[PDB]
C-alpha cells in the first residue's frame, strides 16, 4: 500500500531526473505517479527481455501477489472525495484494432486494472489523432485538450501510450491578494525578469539540508486544504549554486527525509505564481533507465498482448499542467494557525530557480514534480 506507493514514486522520480537533466535551463512539470501508473499497465502487455527490463527498472512486477490490488487501492485513495476539482489523471494504451489479441488478455487486463486497452485503426491517421486526443480531453475535463507529439502517429503505428494530468490545488491557507507584487526573479544565466510573487506570513514546516558537496538548501511545505496534499519548495540558499545541485541528488526517499525532518516555524514566504505545462517524450528517459527493447521494432516483445507481430511502442507521451496561485477555498475543518507574534518575521524569498514536489501525505505518493527556471 505505502509500499507500492514508495516503489511507484521511487521509479517516477528516477524518470523525472532523466527529463530534468536533459533540459537544464527549461521549465518542467512531470508526474512520477503517472509514469509509474501507465508502465505498470504496459507490463501486462510485454514478454521476455522487454518485460524483464521494465520490471527491473520499476522495481516490481504487476503479476506479483498483492501488487495490482495495491495499485488499485492507491488509485481510489488518490482520486478520493478530498478532490475539489483539483486533480485529473488519465492512462491509456492504444493498439491497432486489426491485431489479433492473445486469448484472455483483455479480461485479465480488465480484472487487474478495471479499464480496457483501446483499439483504434491507425490507417485512418487523422481519425487516430482525433481519438487519442479526445481521450486526453474528456478525461482531463478539458484542461488538457491536445498533444503535439501525436503528429508522429502513422498508418503503420501499432502501439501508443499516453498519460495526462492536471493539477490546481486549493491551499489550506490562501495567499492574500493584496500581498501579490511584482519582484525580481534571478534566472540561471544571470539575467532578471519582473514577475508576480505571492506573499504570506505564517507557520510553515521548514528544514535545511546539505548537498554531498557541502551546499545548503531550503525546503518548505505548503499544505493544501485538509492536509491531504502538500507542495514542497526546494532551492539552494546561495544564488551562485545551480538548481542542478539539487536535482542531481533527487530520489523519493530524499523527499520523505525532508518531510520527516520538518519543523513548523513562523516565516514570511515570497513565492512566484506559476503555470507550467510540459509534454514529455518518454522514450529517451525510459531508455536511459534500461528500457530500450520496448521501442525497437524487431527486438520488442509484446507477445502477452499479441503474438503475430512485429509489435513495439511507436510513441509514449506524458503531458502535465499545473497552476499555482493565491486561492484557497478550504475543505479543512481545523480553524486556523496564525502568526500572532508582532516581530518582523524572518523571510524566505524564492526568487531564483526552484523545484517543487506535490505529494499525497497519507500514502507518500509523489504526484507531481518540476523545476521552475522562469515563472
Amino acid at each position: 500500500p505505502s509500499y507500492v506507493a514508495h516503489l511507484a514514486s521511487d521509479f517516477g522520480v528516477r524518470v523525472f531526473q532523466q527529463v530534468a537533466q536533459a533540459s537544464k535551463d527549461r521549465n518542467v512539470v512531470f508526474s512520477p505517479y503517472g509514469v509509474a501508473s501507465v508502465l505498470a499497465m504496459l507490463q501486462l502487455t510485454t514478454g521476455g527481455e522487454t518485460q524483464q527490463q521494465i520490471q527491473a527498472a520499476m522495481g516490481f512486477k504487476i503479476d506479483d501477489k498483492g501488487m495490482a490490488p495495491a495499485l488499485r487501492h492507491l488509485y481510489k485513495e488518490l482520486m478520493g472525495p478530498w478532490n475539489k476539482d483539483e486533480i485529473s489523471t488519465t492512462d491509456a494504451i492504444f493498439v491497432q484494432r486489426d491485431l489479433k489479441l492473445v486469448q484472455g488478455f483483455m479480461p485479465h487486463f480488465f480484472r487487474l486494472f478495471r479499464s480496457t486497452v483501446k483499439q483504434v485503426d491507425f490507417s485512418e491517421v487523422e481519425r487516430a489523432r482525433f481519438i487519442i486526443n479526445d481521450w486526453v480531453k474528456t478525461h482531463t475535463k478539458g484542461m488538457i485538450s491536445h498533444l503535439l507529439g501525436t503528429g508522429a502517429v502513422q498508418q503503420l503505428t501499432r502501439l501508443v501510450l499516453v498519460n495526462a494530468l492536471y493539477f490546481n490545488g486549493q491551499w489550506k491557507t490562501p495567499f492574500p491578494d493584496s500581498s501579490t507584487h511584482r519582484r525580481l526573479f534571478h534566472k540561471s544565466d544571470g539575467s532578471t525578469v519582473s514577475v508576480p510573487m505571492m506573499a504570506q506570513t505564517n507557520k510553515f514546516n521548514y528544514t535545511e539540508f546539505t548537498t554531498p558537496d557541502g551546499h545548503y538548501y531550503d525546503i518548505l511545505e505548503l499544505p493544501y486544504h485538509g492536509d491531504t496534499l502538500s507542495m514542497f519548495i526546494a532551492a539552494p540558499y546561495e544564488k551562485e549554486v545551480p538548481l542542478s545541485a539539487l536535482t542531481n541528488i533527487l530520489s523519493a526517499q530524499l523527499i520523505s527525509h525532508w518531510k520527516g525532518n520538518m519543523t513548523r516555524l513562523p516565516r514570511l514566504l515570497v513565492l512566484p505564481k506559476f503555470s507550467l505545462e510540459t509534454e514529455v517524450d518518454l522514450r529517451k528517459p525510459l531508455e536511459n533507465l534500461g528500457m530500450t527493447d520496448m521501442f525497437r521494432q524487431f527486438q520488442a516483445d509484446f507477445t502477452s498482448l499479441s503474438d503475430q507481430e512485429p509489435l513495439h511502442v511507436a510513441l509514449a507521451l506524458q503531458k502535465v499542467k499545473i497552476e499555482v496561485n493565491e486561492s484557497g477555498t478550504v475543505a479543512s475543518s481545523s480553524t486556523a494557525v496564525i502568526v500572532s507574534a508582532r516581530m518582523a518575521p524572518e523571510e524566505i524569498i524564492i526568487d531564483r530557480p526552484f523545484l517543487f514536489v506535490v505529494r499525497h501525505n497519507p500514502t507518500g505518493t509523489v504526484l507531481f514534480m518540476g523545476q521552475v527556471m522562469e515563472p
Partner: protein, 247 residues
C-alpha cells in the same frame, strides 16, 4: 503601525531600533525597544528567542529612519541579552514576552542623553491607567498587515486601553489573554500595531509621567474587529526587571 502618522525620534526619544545580522553578513530589522536606563533597553523575548546569541544584534538609539542614518544617533552592541525563562507560546498568546538588552558602543560607553536620546519611566508595581485611557504606540512596523515593505520613517498612533473582562470575552480572545498582559485598540478598529512593531512601547500618562505601560507583543491580524493589540503588562514585571538590571 496601522493608521496614525509619521513621527520623529525627538517625539519618541526612548525608542530603540533593533537589528539582526544574518549568516553571510546581511542586516535586517527585527524589533523595537525602549531605553529605561543608560545601559538598558527593554523589549520582547519572542523577537530573540530563535536567535538568542547576543553577538548577532545591533541596537540604535536616536534613529529616525529604517535604512539610513539620523544625525545624533548612536550604534550599540549587545553586551547581555536576557530573555524570560518562563516565556512560552500557546495557540495564540505569548506569555512573559519581555526581554532586556544591555548596550555598549565601540568606545565602550552607555547611552548619552540628547534631544533625541532619553529614558522612559517605568510604572510602579501593579500601577496602571484606567481602562479607556488614550495611549501612544510607536514603531517601524508595517502600515498594513498585507504589506511587504516597512516604512522608512518611524510612525506613531493612539490606542485606548481595554479591560481584561472585555478582552477575555469569547469573540475577542477568551482565556488567551492573562492578567500579565494588556489589550489596547481603536474604538473603530482603524488603528493598531503590526508586524515589525514588537518590543516597542505602549506609552501612557501615569501620575504626571511619561510611562512605559506596555510592550508590543502579539495580536490576531493588525487592526481587526474584536482583536485588540496585546501588550506585556509592564507593571507586573518590576521585580524581574529590577533583579535582571543588576546583571
Amino acid at each position: 503601525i496601522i493608521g496614525g502618522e509619521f513621527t520623529t525620534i525627538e517625539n519618541q526619544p526612548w525608542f530603540a531600533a533593533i537589528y539582526r545580522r544574518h549568516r553571510g553578513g546581511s542586516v535586517t530589522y527585527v524589533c523595537g525597544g525602549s531605553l529605561i536606563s543608560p545601559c538598558w533597553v527593554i523589549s520582547a523575548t519572542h523577537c530573540f528567542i530563535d536567535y538568542p546569541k547576543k553577538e548577532d544584534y545591533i541596537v540604535y538609539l536616536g534613529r529616525s529612519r529604517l535604512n539610513s542614518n539620523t544625525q545624533g544617533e548612536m550604534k550599540f552592541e549587545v553586551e547581555n541579552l536576557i530573555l524570560h525563562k518562563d516565556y512560552s507560546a500557546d495557540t495564540l498568546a505569548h506569555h512573559n514576552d519581555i526581554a532586556l538588552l544591555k548596550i555598549r558602543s565601540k568606545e565602550g560607553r552607555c547611552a548619552q542623553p540628547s534631544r533625541t536620546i532619553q529614558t522612559i519611566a517605568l510604572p510602579s508595581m501593579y500601577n496602571d491607567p484606567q481602562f479607556g485611557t488614550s495611549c501612544e504606540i510607536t514603531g517601524f512596523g508595517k502600515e498594513q498587515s498585507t504589506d511587504y515593505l516597512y516604512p522608512e520613517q518611524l510612525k506613531m498612533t493612539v490606542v485606548k486601553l481595554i479591560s481584561h473582562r472585555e478582552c477575555q470575552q469569547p469573540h475577542y480572545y477568551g482565556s488567551e489573554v492573562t492578567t500579565k498582559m494588556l489589550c489596547a485598540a481603536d474604538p473603530q478598529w482603524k488603528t493598531d500595531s503590526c508586524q515589525g512593531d514588537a518590543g516597542g512601547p505602549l506609552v501612557c500618562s501615569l501620575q504626571g509621567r511619561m510611562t512605559l505601560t506596555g510592550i508590543v507583543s502579539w495580536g490576531r491580524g493588525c487592526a481587526l474587529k474584536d482583536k485588540p493589540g496585546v501588550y506585556t503588562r509592564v507593571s507586573h514585571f518590576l521585580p524581574w526587571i529590577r533583579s535582571h538590571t543588576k546583571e
